[PDB]
């Protein structure tokens, strides 16, 4: 069937949408070439609608069913609990979209009777009705990029009340099932250090290692009614309260399989018959469906000793090489299989023989040396987008601070240390907002983070070596430098000079601030200070951090 049907009605915004990078006093110190940076708006949605709207054909063979059977066998070992209204409300982001029924995110959060009562009736209606499609809102995301222009991505989501109900029935399942089903292949269990560790070990466990990433063209669109039914049958294998079983089935038929699409003004835009991007099961459903399809496609393509790493729709395979010709013909069969299962590629997959040339989760492996000169691997990426978005966040307050997300996830990198840390700590010092808790996203989940805990966070996710890393690869250095020339970002010798200031200013303040200066900026000085384990680092509660993915799942820890 068709992924989408359109009435002709326009996808509308809520407020005004800026496409031009906003400029303030701090902007120029980070980025000169302001015309290179832009944010997508709802005005480019018409182009996105064309792209993601196609007919899907699915041809399921024996490999497909075998893998599914294996997945169900493990899923049936899981016991998941029904969450209470209260517990589910505590999981709602403070900046989450208001309900059409008179209450908002903060009303839900502090458990007002108006919020709690409507959630109960939405739940009750879920138990009684397993057929009536549920209203969803379609919006256009505002994402910032650098020109190379991309049309906006679409977000489809049900009303707040339903989102809380999703959490009640499905929060435990989506948090626990994927690891049990997919084992070490499930990538959202991994912190950066563990992921690097796992990619490298996997690369080393192969006599002649070959690797490739598989980019599906618009994954959400390729997902069929079948895939959503299949993913529900997986959920139903769990030991579940009879109320959870009813709700899950109901949400599958009424929400996850499809439904009408309503713009922010209240007009009907059309109908969806594919994956909604703003439901709780978006991440887990895509991960299960991607894993199922790929594993089966490995059997069809007869890939020798393949280890898979899956994060939602992001997929990387590492296996034994049969030589460049056989690898090329293997990947075609893989691609044909995936295409038959309704997961065609965007770019054709290419086999890589160097681990560092492989991109997965927008990240590639690279190597540096620590204080002992001892080789250490870390994940990095092209810094073009993270810097473009930092530039935007230098001039505009945002609900999600991507700069912090990038520092947390890319702390060991050259560009996050010298540019991102230096720039933003400079900003926080001038405002005296070091103690101020900030919101960011890790694996789709929203986190309130105090910047002064960054040293303790980095020690736990990357290890101490992250504060010492030096002698970066020529290839990494070339990419970082090429980005700054393109963007008009000051050279890295200017950033070092600025870092000396930021460090001293932090040290002069003592307490947790001096701790930040000591660890985060030890690189900037020739006369190096010794970096021992942090006194109160093991105090921070880092549970929930790397259990599951929750992209568009409206989650807050
Ligand atoms: C700053 C971004 C950083 C952290 C991060 O949240 C992600 C991420 N990766 C994803 C990858 C794929 C999806 N696809 S989806 C929509 O769930 O089907 C969703 C996410 S996500 O929304 O859950 N977030 C991500 O890919 N990265 C890069 C990364 C990943 C692992 C790592 F160890 C280091 C950096």
Curated annotation (Swiss-Prot):
Membrane topology: Single-pass type IV membrane protein
Modified residues (Phosphoserine): 29, 42
Catalytic activity: RNA(n) + a ribonucleoside 5'-triphosphate = RNA(n+1) + diphosphate
Entry superkingdom: Viruses
Residue sites binding Mg(2+) 2 per the record: 215, 313-314
Location in or out of the cell: Host cytoplasm; Host endoplasmic reticulum membrane
Protein activity control: Activity is up-regulated by PRK2/PKN2-mediated phosphorylation.
Post-translational modification: The N-terminus is phosphorylated by host PRK2/PKN2.
Cofactor note: Binds 2 magnesium ion that constitute a dinuclear catalytic metal center.
Outcome reported for the amino acid change (mutating residue 278 to D/L/R): Complete loss of RdRp activity
Role played: RNA-dependent RNA polymerase that performs primer-template recognition and RNA synthesis during viral replication. Initiates RNA transcription/replication at a flavin adenine dinucleotide (FAD), resulting in a 5'- FAD cap on viral RNAs. In this way, recognition of viral 5' RNA by host pattern recognition receptors can be bypassed, thereby evading activation of antiviral pathways.
Quaternary organization: Homooligomer. Interacts with non-structural protein 5A. Interacts with host VAPB. Interacts with host PRK2/PKN2. Interacts with host HNRNPA1 and SEPT6; these interactions facilitate the viral replication. Part of the replication complex composed of NS2, NS3, NS4A, NS4B, NS5A and the RNA-directed RNA polymerase embedded in an ER-derived membranous web.
Name this polypeptide is given: RNA-directed RNA polymerase
Included stretch of the parent chain: 2420 to 2981 of 3010
